């Protein structure tokens, strides 16, 4: 019902990234299915949930506003299942090109990781 569901029916996330192929190529190495839809975009995604990968220049011009040197305005959060996968993911990280901020610790109660991926952008995996 209109007035129960509201107005907005969905809710994704768009980021920037320099190199599609490069990123595509990371993010793949890590496990998330890669989406290529022909109808300069690509999709990344765990379970259900959906991140579009836009290319800088085009990323600029939707925006209407200039990239950050250093970004840092979203945290992305993945879940896992053990410690042991997390360290195994580290490692397949660090492979993959990525930055690995924060080692594999205990922080804030729970076990977990923080690391960059080839365009800054900060992820953290979770033991939950």
Same mark, same amino acid.
């Given at each position: 019902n209109l007035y129960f569901?509201?107005?907005?029916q969905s809710m994704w996330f768009n980021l920037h990234v320099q190199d599609l192929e490069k990123s595509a190529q990371f993010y793949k190495a890590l496990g998330f299915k890669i989406n290529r839809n022909p109808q300069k975009m690509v999709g990344i995604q765990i379970g259900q949930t959906t991140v579009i990968l836009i290319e800088n220049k085009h990323f600029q011009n939707v925006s209407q506003q200039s990239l950050n040197? #250093?970004?840092? #305005?979203v945290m992305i959060s993945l879940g896992v299942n053990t410690n042991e996968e997390v360290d195994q993911l580290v490692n397949k990280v660090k492979e993959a090109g990525g930055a690995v901020v924060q080692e594999p610790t205990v922080s804030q109660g729970f076990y977990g990781a923080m690391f960059k991926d080839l365009d800054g952008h900060h992820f953290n995996f979770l033991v939950c």
């Open positions: 569901q509201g107005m907005i040197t #250093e970004p840092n #305005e």
